[PDB]
Design an enzyme around this catalytic site. Structure first.
Site, PDB file in Angstrom:
ATOM      1  N   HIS A 196       0.907  -1.226  -0.124  1.00 33.68           N
ATOM      2  CA  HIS A 196      -0.001   0.037  -0.086  1.00 33.68           C
ATOM      3  C   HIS A 196       0.723   1.140   0.123  1.00 33.68           C
ATOM      4  CE1 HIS A 196       0.216   0.428   4.533  1.00 33.68           C
ATOM      5  NE2 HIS A 196       0.000   1.370   4.509  1.00 33.68           N
ATOM      6  N   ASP A 213      -0.058  -7.517   2.062  1.00 30.26           N
ATOM      7  CA  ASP A 213       0.617  -6.366   1.910  1.00 30.26           C
ATOM      8  C   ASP A 213       2.127  -6.265   1.948  1.00 30.26           C
ATOM      9  OD1 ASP A 213       0.880  -3.469   2.055  1.00 30.26           O
ATOM     10  OD2 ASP A 213       0.034  -3.289   3.944  1.00 30.26           O
ATOM     11  N   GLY A 239       2.919   6.783   8.566  1.00 26.98           N
ATOM     12  CA  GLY A 239       4.253   7.311   8.171  1.00 26.98           C
ATOM     13  C   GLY A 239       5.247   6.359   8.480  1.00 26.98           C
ATOM     14  N   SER A 273       4.518   3.089   8.179  1.00 23.76           N
ATOM     15  CA  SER A 273       3.826   1.816   6.900  1.00 23.76           C
ATOM     16  C   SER A 273       5.148   1.221   6.224  1.00 23.76           C
ATOM     17  CB  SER A 273       2.919   2.232   6.167  1.00 23.76           C
ATOM     18  OG  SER A 273       1.717   2.916   6.638  1.00 23.76           O
ATOM     19  N   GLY A 274       5.349   0.084   6.021  1.00 18.43           N
ATOM     20  CA  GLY A 274       6.497  -0.393   5.107  1.00 18.43           C
ATOM     21  C   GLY A 274       7.675  -0.775   5.759  1.00 18.43           C
TER      22      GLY A 274
HETATM   23 NA    NA Z   1       9.106   2.578   9.541  1.00 13.71          NA
END
Ligand code: NA
Ligand code: CA
Length: 223
Positions: free
Chosen positions: A40, A84, A175, A177-178
Site C-alpha cells: 500500500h 501487503d 508514516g 508503514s512499510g
Molecule cells: Na517505518
C-alpha cells in the site's frame, strides 16, 4: 511510533525511508540491491534513502538511490490489505557498511510472546499529529492470534499478525508503514494497518514475512 524512544543515529542500519519529494513510507534493506516495504506504499518515482537518522538534515552517512522497478505481491488486495508486501530494486547497489546493513529473512515464523523492535519516522501522537525528524524505536511483543482476531473480527488472515499493547499507549502509526518489525535478528513483519494509533484494544497489524520467503527469493533472482 507512539510511546517509543529515539533509537540513536544509525542503530537500525537496515531501515530505509522511501521519498517522493517527502518521506512517505519506510522499508527494510534485504541485500545491496533490494528493499521490501508494504504494497500500500506503492508509488511510481521513489527514491530510497539509506543511512538516515534526521530525515530533514543531511548528516553525512546517507545514500539516495532511485528505484528501477517495484513488484507488488501478485495477490495483494487493497481492500483487506491481505498480502501487503512489495519489493523495490535499486538502480545501483548500495554500499553496505556500519551504518547501512541488510536484515536477514526468517527461517521459521515467530511465537506469540517474542519481543520485536519496530522503528520509523511516523506520527508520535495517538490523538494529534506530531511527526518527528529522527528515527523512533518501540519494543513490542507478538500477541496471540486470538487477541488479534478478537480486536478485528473477520479482518485478520493467516498473512497477518498483531504486535503491541492491548492497554494502548505504544504502537506504530502512519508514516511508519512499510517499515520493519525484527524479532531475534530476523525480519518477521512490515507495518501495515491498525485502527488509529495506540488506542486500547486496537494493536497494530503487520504483514507476516515468514509466509513470503520463497516468493521473495524467487522474485529477486529472476529480476
Ligand atoms: Na517505518
Ligand atoms: Ca539525513
Amino acid at each position: 511510533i507512539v510511546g517509543g524512544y529515539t533509537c540513536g543515529a544509525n542503530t537500525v542500519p537496515y531501515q530505509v525511508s522511501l521519498n517522493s519529494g517527502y518521506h512517505f513510507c519506510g522499508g527494510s534493506l534485504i541485500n545491496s540491491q533490494w528493499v521490501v516495504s508494504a504494497a500500500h506504499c506503492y508509488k511510481s518515482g521513489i527514491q530510497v534513502r539509506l543511512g538516515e537518522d534526521n530525515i530533514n538534515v543531511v548528516e553525512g552517512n546517507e545514500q539516495f538511490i532511485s528505484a528501477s522497478k517495484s513488484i507488488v505481491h501478485p495477490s495483494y488486495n487493497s481492500n483487506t490489505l491481505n498480502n501487503d508486501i512489495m519489493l523495490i530494486k535499486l538502480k545501483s547497489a548500495a554500499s553496505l557498511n556500519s551504518r547501512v546493513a541488510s536484515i536477514s529473512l526468517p527461517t521459521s515464523c515467530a511465537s506469540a510472546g517474542t519481543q520485536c523492535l519496530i522503528s520509523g519516522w511516523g506520527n508520535t501522537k495517538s490523538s494529534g499529529t506530531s511527526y518527528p525528524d529522527v528515527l523512533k524505536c518501540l519494543k513490542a511483543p507478538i500477541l496471540s492470534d486470538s487477541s488479534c482476531k478478537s480486536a478485528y473480527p473477520g479482518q485478520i488472515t493467516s498473512n497477518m499478525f498483531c504486535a503491541g499493547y492491548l492497554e494502548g499507549g505504544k504502537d506504530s502509526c502512519q508514516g511508519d508503514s512499510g517499515g520493519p518489525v525484527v524479532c531475534s535478528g530476523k525480519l518477521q513483519g512490515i507495518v501495515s494497518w491498525g485502527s488509529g494509533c495506540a488506542q486500547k484494544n486496537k494493536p497494530g497489524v503487520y504483514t507476516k514475512v515468514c509466509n513470503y520467503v520463497s516468493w521473495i527469493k524467487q522474485t529477486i533472482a529472476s529480476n
